[PDB]
Design a protein around this nucleic acid. Structure first.
Ligand SMILES: [Mg+2]
Ligand SMILES: [Mg+2]
Ligand SMILES: [Mg+2]
Ligand SMILES: [Mg+2]
Ligand SMILES: [Mg+2]
Ligand SMILES: [Mg+2]
Ligand SMILES: [Mg+2]
Ligand SMILES: [Mg+2]
Ligand SMILES: [Mg+2]
Ligand SMILES: [Mg+2]
Ligand SMILES: [Mg+2]
Ligand SMILES: [Mg+2]
Ligand SMILES: [Mg+2]
Ligand SMILES: [Mg+2]
Ligand SMILES: [Mg+2]
Ligand SMILES: [Mg+2]
Ligand SMILES: [Mg+2]
Ligand SMILES: [Mg+2]
Ligand SMILES: [Mg+2]
Ligand SMILES: [Mg+2]
Ligand SMILES: [Mg+2]
Ligand SMILES: [Mg+2]
Ligand SMILES: [Mg+2]
Ligand SMILES: [Mg+2]
Ligand SMILES: [Mg+2]
Ligand SMILES: [Mg+2]
Ligand SMILES: [Mg+2]
Ligand SMILES: [Mg+2]
Ligand SMILES: [Mg+2]
Ligand SMILES: [Mg+2]
Ligand SMILES: [Mg+2]
Ligand SMILES: [Mg+2]
Ligand SMILES: [Mg+2]
Ligand SMILES: [Mg+2]
Ligand SMILES: [Mg+2]
Ligand SMILES: [Mg+2]
Ligand SMILES: [Mg+2]
Ligand SMILES: [Mg+2]
Ligand SMILES: [Mg+2]
Ligand SMILES: [Mg+2]
Ligand SMILES: [Mg+2]
Ligand SMILES: [Mg+2]
Ligand SMILES: [Mg+2]
Ligand SMILES: [Mg+2]
Ligand SMILES: [Mg+2]
Ligand SMILES: [Mg+2]
Ligand SMILES: [Mg+2]
Ligand SMILES: [Mg+2]
Ligand SMILES: [Mg+2]
Ligand SMILES: [Mg+2]
Ligand SMILES: [Mg+2]
Ligand SMILES: [Mg+2]
Ligand SMILES: [Mg+2]
Ligand SMILES: [Mg+2]
Ligand SMILES: [Mg+2]
Ligand SMILES: [Mg+2]
Ligand SMILES: [Mg+2]
Ligand SMILES: [Mg+2]
Ligand SMILES: [Mg+2]
Ligand SMILES: [Mg+2]
Ligand SMILES: [Mg+2]
Ligand SMILES: [Mg+2]
Ligand SMILES: [Mg+2]
Ligand SMILES: [Mg+2]
Ligand SMILES: [Mg+2]
Ligand SMILES: [Mg+2]
Ligand SMILES: [Mg+2]
Ligand SMILES: [Mg+2]
Ligand SMILES: [Mg+2]
Ligand SMILES: [Mg+2]
Ligand SMILES: [Mg+2]
Ligand SMILES: [Mg+2]
Ligand SMILES: [Mg+2]
Ligand SMILES: [Mg+2]
Ligand SMILES: [Mg+2]
Ligand SMILES: [Mg+2]
Ligand SMILES: [Mg+2]
Ligand SMILES: [Mg+2]
Ligand SMILES: [Mg+2]
Ligand SMILES: [Mg+2]
Ligand SMILES: [Mg+2]
Ligand SMILES: [Mg+2]
Ligand SMILES: [Mg+2]
Ligand SMILES: [Mg+2]
Ligand SMILES: [Mg+2]
Ligand SMILES: [Mg+2]
Ligand SMILES: [Mg+2]
Ligand SMILES: [Mg+2]
Ligand SMILES: [Mg+2]
Ligand SMILES: [Mg+2]
Ligand SMILES: [Mg+2]
Ligand SMILES: [Mg+2]
Ligand SMILES: [Mg+2]
Ligand SMILES: [Mg+2]
Ligand SMILES: [Mg+2]
Ligand SMILES: [Mg+2]
Ligand SMILES: [Mg+2]
Ligand SMILES: [Mg+2]
Ligand SMILES: [Mg+2]
Ligand SMILES: [Mg+2]
Ligand SMILES: [Mg+2]
Lengths: 260, 200, 126, 148
RNA sequence: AGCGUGCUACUUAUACUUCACCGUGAUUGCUGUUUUGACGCUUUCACGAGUAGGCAGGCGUGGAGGUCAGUGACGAAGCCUUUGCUGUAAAGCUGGGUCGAACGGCCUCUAGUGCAGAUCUUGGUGGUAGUAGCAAAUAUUCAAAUGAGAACUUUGAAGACUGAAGUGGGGAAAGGUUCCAUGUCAACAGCAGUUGGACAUGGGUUAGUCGAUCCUAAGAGAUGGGGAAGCUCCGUUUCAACGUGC
RNA sequence: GGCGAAAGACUAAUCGAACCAUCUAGUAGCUGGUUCCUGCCGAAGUUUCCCUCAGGAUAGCAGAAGCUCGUAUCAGUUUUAU
RNA sequence: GCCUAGACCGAGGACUGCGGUUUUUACCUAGGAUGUUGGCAUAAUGAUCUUAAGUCGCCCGUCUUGAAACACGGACCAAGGAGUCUAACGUCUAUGCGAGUGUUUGGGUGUAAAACCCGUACGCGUAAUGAAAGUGAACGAAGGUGGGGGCCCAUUAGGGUGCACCAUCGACCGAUCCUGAUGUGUUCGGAUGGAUUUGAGUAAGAGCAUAGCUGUUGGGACCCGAAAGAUGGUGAACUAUGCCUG
RNA sequence: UGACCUCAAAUCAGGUAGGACUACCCGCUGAACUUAAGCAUAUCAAUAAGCGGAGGAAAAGAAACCAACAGGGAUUGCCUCAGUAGCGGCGAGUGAAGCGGCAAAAGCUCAAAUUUGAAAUCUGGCGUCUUUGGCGUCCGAGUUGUAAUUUGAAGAAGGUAUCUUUGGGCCCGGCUCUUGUCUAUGUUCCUUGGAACAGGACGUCACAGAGGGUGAGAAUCCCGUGCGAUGAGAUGACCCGGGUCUGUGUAAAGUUCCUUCGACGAGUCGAGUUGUUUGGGAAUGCAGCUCUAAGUGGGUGGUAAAUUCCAUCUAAAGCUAAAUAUUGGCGAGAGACCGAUAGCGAACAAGUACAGUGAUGGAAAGAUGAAAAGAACUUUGAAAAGAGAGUGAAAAAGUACGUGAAAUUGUUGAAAGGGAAGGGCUUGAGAUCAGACUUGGUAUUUUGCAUGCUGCGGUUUACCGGGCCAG
């Protein structure tokens, strides 16, 4: 708010003894503003309690390694069909994830051709989902340049841009991203894992140089992909295994019988 | 006002500090405009480099002796050793410093070698030069083409040679000699004048 | 999406530029599409509506009506067609105001400036 | 976030957690470190002894660069040897050829003598060493070479 | 049906006993039947007062990312209502009426986020109450005219008063069109109104001789100068080569 | 500051120091208020110091988070001995 | 031991148990209600609203030892209305990396305040102690003793090994005090051995960074509230006093 | 009879200054509230108010610097140094600098020198021309010093081996800025609606699915958006690329070495004292007064003094872009901001109406409808109005205009009521609401379907069993 809002008055308290509250009041006469309360957060025309300041903290620091951790986790989550489906993507007619497309799609220059390729590879039902999802935003945010809302479509990741970025620019919901610069705002929109990612072959083959492997060092300086604290992530087979089940005592009833 | 087992703080906020709060909202905007200024400056004078050649100098003080960094300009003696006048040097991308001198040979030799390396890659155009030759050149980054390079620390294998006096004893004796130099010299002067004045 | 830094996506700025548009600016805003016959005759798809054009109403309660434009009433952002009248219980008739984007031009009023405008826009006039 | 604060939970309760008798006030007790010798003596004496008074001599215009002398102990000295060549050096080091460790070039002023060295000759270049650090270096067959 | 004393029965607390249900704490068991909930299900026992205060789990509001390819001009939101349902509750959902353009559920983010009070703020509305009151300045009445309408307008007749230090006839200050004619009654004239200093439309102020203008008064104040960091202060012919001379 | 045949009178309904704006959201150990639900736990008015006595700090009382363990050796009680 | 009158309740939901009778691998009263009959389903039944009757019930908020108080605020209603943000911090928690850690001053890059990338320095940590000159952390399996979860060997017990941590006696580094070797710019050096002394130390590192709650200090600082103080201006149309002209 | 010096006058010829704005900038002057739990030093604060002066930036700036190193190297800003050294009733508090990483980088000008074989310099008048000016000429300024030459990094004067570099004016381009013109695809069908811009079907364009308008949520109706293309105007000693005309280059400048020299700022430095200020502490800067220099001298080297050294600069004269600041002006783009008691005081004829002698103080107030289609006409009334009618999708939109809450009020209906009313619990009464003959199953007949009898409402008596209330 303005630094002087509510404080452009010469108001002075009347003091006690005049049967009115001790709030400051406008002086003078001849206008209806005269004698009216001022300066108070409870007063009409006063300044708000604790007026908002610009030196509030707006940007937040995140450790670079943790940010990379989360980016890798989101990329990994993009290959889990259950996560992509819970994420809301119409991916039921894609035969396997990750969806990798040939490099000719890096060279499409017309939106018609890019849409045709999206239709061919089975990624256009999610574009149709974006098209059908357009609604007027609820609330005053529509007065602030945010008039419509819609879903997110597929994310197309390339290695070389020979026209694909501009060809997909106008398709609603589709985002394009270089494999060299992938971030969490695209990989996990809304902090929800499982983005529907369409890789070109070049981007898929560059992933291993970008993030490294057990045989390849990452281009990122001193960076290694994270290690899990658990090796077998399926604990039902760990519990119901020969090694563990051979040393346990026999199980009781799932529910104790009531004896009294 | 003072309560609990807490550190005692020094929060200097008793003046009208809120009238002098500079929040750098324009960090990204200034970064972008700074880059645009840099492109305009480069494109104006291409293929001439945007950076003048800078010398390499030791950083001062006992804390930064080990480090070596870019200086401000080459000394008059250094330019003299490569046969360049300072007035001329300023016009071919070489920086001059009339204030710095060369007490020692090491920095002087490093900067003479640096000037000779830059001078070998220099190509000065003239009227007879056509735009075909000028377009055959790319605008290099002098700060990267002639970087400031730290001398490598000594490492590897060498023969062990053990002096009889330990290093700790050497340091202690140096400290003691410095501490008592003045009083010992005064004592010796008094002794000499006494034993050579009455011995007249 | 817009790319130029000189283009504004502000709703308030766009509406202010519309309702405070000068009369000269309102001429372009009150453009009308040509009919299919004139579009192939002149190879131009829309023109600023002019006083003596003939239009066909394609939207609203007067859809299907035809007539000659009587006035481009630029202050009200409307055109008044020849016989598109509403009859008050008084017995008097007031013209019905129609936006030019809700009609098609079926016959152009031509002069030396209209022809140059059509030829400027890549079309063919005479 | 404000929605997690106890201000949201105090809504509806009269005193906002400040008490009906105490009545949260402007500055009871003073501002800042007021009354440190009078009514906050019991706090400063208990938790900050040594607070009042002068100790030692002043130093006009103290330049901290003069006193720069980072320490490295002996148990950390072989980390300055190249990692790719440490294992070869730990085997083939002798009096005729021992690794040189330039401690100043790595940012250290004094070599201290905590810990144990590998029983392997080394040449340690330092501005300063402690008495025991140099005794331990000589015992493994090494030497300390003073530099500046 | 009092006093002292003894006895039998009977009366009833949120207390005690048995039982149901809620919650809290502990506790039993649950993966070759773990079986799409193990932050889950399940056995058993005990316990439950509370200001100041602490903590936990939830309800609600504005806006943000995501999702429901959610609701909606065949009616969103809002509002009224013994239409009810759900929850210990904060509240959520729903029938009918009204209405007219947006709005919600869920996973998260965020905050200018919840009112009965502060002689709180601004706006609005009551009881009081058709009440206090509309009582100084002697005093009005008859008739006609006008008008829808006359205690109050106009005219006539009368009765009165101010009583020339006036309730008369002019002016200075101050106001500014209130002046005059015509029309005119929504508001204003604390009743009324056809009347008005109200409202609307027009008209109207004529100078050589009346004033201003000119003179100087107490005083105000440039210049030449002298102070003052300076805004400016002093000084008024002043330590001045002072005539736009006749 | 003025002015006062003097009353602290008068200086624009303002006078034992006018009015206006700003510093200024001046400071207040003092008065008043401080906005949803349920669940669990639950006080103090006492010690010492303080120009301290309507206030603080300190210790106590209270909550929360737990941690190390699993009957180890504790108790606002009795007995016996002293 | 036996007979006999009444009231309230019916949690649970295949089996599993303990008993009993055994005519029996069956039955029972024995780990919680079944059987049967009538009526009703336009209704007997239940809930809410209004009202009557019986019984109880003082006006909320506040300060207070004590309020329904003859203590204070509150006529009524709507809308607004009070622990916020920031700099620097303590504890705790989550997360990443870990003897390191922190990309974001800046450079690169960009689909352009985003995302992505880069590294030198620097901050904190990895060494303390002394006023300072200065000096600077292993006798030993990084010590001994008593406990100590877990693990190993056993076979109640018992033995071995015992991290974290607790109590205790030592060792090492710095300061203080004492002693004072070979030596020497003869006044320096300080080996060696000690001391009811002392440090926020060593004794196989634990930190750094981001975020959240709570607490702290400075800021308007939960909201509203002085009497005052200062700086710069405006008034002698009232009034006080002098003067000039009536 | 004339010079010169000093000082005047003119409506003399030609110029220049004042005042405004406020966000940032350069100075002067200068508080107190406040904190210290009192208060006077201190703090607030070298801040507010007051005064003088600028610009697009200002200021500072090419060391009388920092240092103590193996040395850096004009100024400015950022990060850090560092809440540190220090200052402080050593209390409350306060508080820089060097180094280091980076942004940006750019250097120089006078005075002091004899042109002395030639005042070589310049304002002005007059004339003329191709006019931000050139040329010619004449007065004047100026020797009490205007040009050339040098600025300490040097440099001068002689000698010296020769070598290397180069002036100006126009014309078209490019760059920069502004601006004009030009551009893809449905208004196809059905339903609702007053209106399609809604839903459904079939599509199209997309380097354009930003935004706005149009009778409701419109990429495809319109303007735009995106992509570029092409004109016009400007601008630039101090941007470059070409041309083109003159270059009067025995000239100007630099480069190597030798010799002789090498002018370098005074009421200033410095010292004392006083006041203020600073972190600056036997005194950091500034200022007043008193004293008052020197020439390897002078300053600095954060503890006063004398003696001896060392290090490092070179004051008392001057200019200079960029990085830096920016609640003002101008032009733009935005936002997890506010949504008419909010947001600026002001969304409106708002610094308006209105108040005050004055300085000053200072509001309230947005929304019919797509469109006035703003109700013709008849009738009652003095009129305002009313009643019919009419327009409209709606008058449950009539300008006393969207929705239209509460307080408060009228009418109708229901009920209750002996000096309050209101509440809880319980039941009665009245009103309302709810629920199992279940999605009940068993065979049965007829009424109805597009159809070829088949899913299945329909009916009553039978039987199975169920629900609820009870004995
Ligand atoms: Mg406001
Ligand atoms: Mg302190
Ligand atoms: Mg030097
Ligand atoms: Mg409570
Ligand atoms: Mg309350
Ligand atoms: Mg509390
Ligand atoms: Mg209170
Ligand atoms: Mg008390
Ligand atoms: Mg308290
Ligand atoms: Mg009795
Ligand atoms: Mg008795
Ligand atoms: Mg009970
Ligand atoms: Mg309780
Ligand atoms: Mg908000
Ligand atoms: Mg829909
Ligand atoms: Mg309804
Ligand atoms: Mg509705
Ligand atoms: Mg509407
Ligand atoms: Mg949503
Ligand atoms: Mg609020
Ligand atoms: Mg209220
Ligand atoms: Mg009121
Ligand atoms: Mg009233
Ligand atoms: Mg009466
Ligand atoms: Mg009276
Ligand atoms: Mg009469
Ligand atoms: Mg009389
Ligand atoms: Mg009149
Ligand atoms: Mg009246
Ligand atoms: Mg009347
Ligand atoms: Mg009038
Ligand atoms: Mg006269
Ligand atoms: Mg006259
Ligand atoms: Mg006079
Ligand atoms: Mg004067
Ligand atoms: Mg008196
Ligand atoms: Mg008065
Ligand atoms: Mg306040
Ligand atoms: Mg008190
Ligand atoms: Mg309890
Ligand atoms: Mg005391
Ligand atoms: Mg009290
Ligand atoms: Mg049961
Ligand atoms: Mg009672
Ligand atoms: Mg009270
Ligand atoms: Mg009392
Ligand atoms: Mg009470
Ligand atoms: Mg009483
Ligand atoms: Mg009282
Ligand atoms: Mg009171
Ligand atoms: Mg009252
Ligand atoms: Mg409210
Ligand atoms: Mg580091
Ligand atoms: Mg450190
Ligand atoms: Mg030290
Ligand atoms: Mg340790
Ligand atoms: Mg106040
Ligand atoms: Mg005051
Ligand atoms: Mg005072
Ligand atoms: Mg007067
Ligand atoms: Mg003149
Ligand atoms: Mg001025
Ligand atoms: Mg001051
Ligand atoms: Mg203050
Ligand atoms: Mg004080
Ligand atoms: Mg106080
Ligand atoms: Mg005081
Ligand atoms: Mg100060
Ligand atoms: Mg000021
Ligand atoms: Mg200007
Ligand atoms: Mg600039
Ligand atoms: Mg300048
Ligand atoms: Mg110089
Ligand atoms: Mg510098
Ligand atoms: Mg200060
Ligand atoms: Mg630097
Ligand atoms: Mg001339
Ligand atoms: Mg177009
Ligand atoms: Mg629209
Ligand atoms: Mg459609
Ligand atoms: Mg649109
Ligand atoms: Mg000089
Ligand atoms: Mg001063
Ligand atoms: Mg001084
Ligand atoms: Mg002095
Ligand atoms: Mg100078
Ligand atoms: Mg300057
Ligand atoms: Mg800015
Ligand atoms: Mg600006
Ligand atoms: Mg805006
Ligand atoms: Mg407003
Ligand atoms: Mg307002
Ligand atoms: Mg309205
Ligand atoms: Mg009539
Ligand atoms: Mg309607
Ligand atoms: Mg309506
Ligand atoms: Mg209405
Ligand atoms: Mg009502
Ligand atoms: Mg009665
Ligand atoms: Mg009842
Ligand atoms: Mg009933």
């Amino acid at each position: 708010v303005a630094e002087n809002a509510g404080h452009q008055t010469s108001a002075e308290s009347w003091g006690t003894g005049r049967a009115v509250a001790r709030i400051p009041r406008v002086g003078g006469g001849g206008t209806h503003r005269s004698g009216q309360a001022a300066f108070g957060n409870m007063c009409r025309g006063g300044r708000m309690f604790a007026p908002t300041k610009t030196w509030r903290r707006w940007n937040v620091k995140v450790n670079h390694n943790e940010k990379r951790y989360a980016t890798a986790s989101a990329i990994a989550a993009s290959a889990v069909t259950s996560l992509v489906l819970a994420r809301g993507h119409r991916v039921e007619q894609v035969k396997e994830l990750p969806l990798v497309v040939s490099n000719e799609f890096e060279s499409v220059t017309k939106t018609k051709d890019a849409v045709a390729v999206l239709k061919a590879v089975g990624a256009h039902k999610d574009v149709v989902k974006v098209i059908k999802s357009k609604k007027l935003r609820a609330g005053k945010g529509k007065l602030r340049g945010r008039r419509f809302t819609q879903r997110r479509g597929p994310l197309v990741v390339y290695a070389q841009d020979n026209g694909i970025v501009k060809a997909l620019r106008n398709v609603p919901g589709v985002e394009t991203a270089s494999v060299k610069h992938l971030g969490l705002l695209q990989l996990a929109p809304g902090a929800h894992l499982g983005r529907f990612i369409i890789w070109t072959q070049g981007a898929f083959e560059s992933l291993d140089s970008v993030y490294g492997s057990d045989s390849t060092k990452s281009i990122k300086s001193g960076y290694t992909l994270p290690s899990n604290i658990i090796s077998n992530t399926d604990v039902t087979r760990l519990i119901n295994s020969a090694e563990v089940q051979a040393v346990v005592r026999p199980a009781g009833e799932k529910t104790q019988k009531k004896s009294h | 006002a003072i309560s609990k087992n807490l550190p005692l703080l020094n929060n200097h906020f008793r003046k009208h500090w809120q009238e002098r709060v500079r929040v750098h909202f324009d960090q990204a905007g200034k970064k972008a405009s700074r880059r645009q200024s840099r492109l305009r400056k480069a494109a104006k004078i291409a293929p001439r480099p945007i950076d003048a050649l800078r010398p390499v100098v030791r950083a001062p003080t006992v804390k930064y002796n080990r480090k070596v960094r870019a200086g401000r300009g080459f000394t008059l003696a250094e330019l003299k050793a490569v046969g360049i006048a300072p007035k001329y040097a300023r016009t071919i991308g070489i920086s001059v410093d009339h204030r710095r001198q060369n007490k020692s040979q090491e920095t002087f030799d490093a900067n003479v070698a640096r000037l000779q390396e830059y001078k070998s890659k220099l190509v000065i155009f003239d009227k007879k030069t056509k735009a075909s030759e000028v377009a055959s050149f790319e605008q290099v980054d002098v700060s990267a083409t002639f970087p400031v390079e730290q001398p490598a620390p000594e490492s590897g294998l060498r023969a062990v040679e053990v002096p009889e006096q330990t290093a700790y004893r050497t340091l202690r004796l140096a400290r003691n000699e410095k501490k008592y130099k003045g009083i010992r010299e005064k004592r010796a002067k008094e002794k000499a004048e006494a034993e050579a004045e009455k011995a007249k | 999406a817009k790319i130029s830094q000189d283009v504004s996506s502000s709703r308030s700025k766009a509406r202010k530029a519309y309702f405070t548009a000068s009369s000269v600016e309102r001429r372009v805003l009150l453009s009308a599409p040509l009919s299919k016959e004139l579009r192939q005759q002149y190879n131009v798809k829309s023109l600023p509506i002019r006083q003596n054009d003939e239009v066909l109403v394609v939207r609203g309660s007067k859809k299907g009506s035809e007539g000659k434009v009587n006035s481009v009433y630029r202050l009200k952002f409307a055109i008044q067609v020849d016989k598109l009248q509403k009859e008050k219980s008084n017995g008097a008739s007031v013209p019905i105001n129609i936006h030019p984007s809700k009609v098609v031009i079926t016959k152009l009023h031509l002069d030396k400036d209209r022809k140059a405008l059509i030829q400027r826009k890549g079309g063919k006039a005479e | 976030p404000t929605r997690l604060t106890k201000t949201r939970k105090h809504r509806g309760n009269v005193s906002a957690g400040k008490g009906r008798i105490g009545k949260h006030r402007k500055h009871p007790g003073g501002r800042g470190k007021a009354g440190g010798q009078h009514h906050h003596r019991t706090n400063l004496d208990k938790y900050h002894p040594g607070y009042f008074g002068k100790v030692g001599m002043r130093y006009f215009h103290k330049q901290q660069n003069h006193f720069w002398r980072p320490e490295i102990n002996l148990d950390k000295l072989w980390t300055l040897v190249d990692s790719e060549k440490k294992d070869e050096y730990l085997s083939k080091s002798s009096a005729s050829a021992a690794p040189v460790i330039d401690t100043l070039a790595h940012g250290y002023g004094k070599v201290l003598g905590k810990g144990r060295l590998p029983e392997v000759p080394v040449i340690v270049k330092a501005r300063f060493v402690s008495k025991l650090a140099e005794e331990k270096i000589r015992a493994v067959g090494g030497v300390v070479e003073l530099v500046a």
